[PDB]
Amino acid sequence: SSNPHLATFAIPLGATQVPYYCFFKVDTYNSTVYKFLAVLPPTVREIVIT
């Protein structure tokens, strides 16, 4: 799904089926929202953060 604010995002699926919308829930006790990261590609090989 794409609205954790309304839809439960407890994953009901696995086995790589259908791309997954991925967000970042904000950890701060005011407006904990989910910053949309991206549509998960079916394959991820390199990830990097800085």
Binding site: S1, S2, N3, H5, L6, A7, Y21, V39
Partner: peptide, 29 residues
């Protein structure tokens, strides 16, 4: 103020993304 930037909706619309379109193998703009 009217605009397409925001839309006061009774329910939010999870999945509003992509909404793209195209015509493959077609001379197209």
């Amino acid at each position: 103020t009217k605009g397409e930037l925001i839309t006061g909706t009774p329910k939010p619309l999870e999945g509003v993304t992509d909404v793209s379109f195209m015509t493959l193998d077609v001379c197209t703009k």
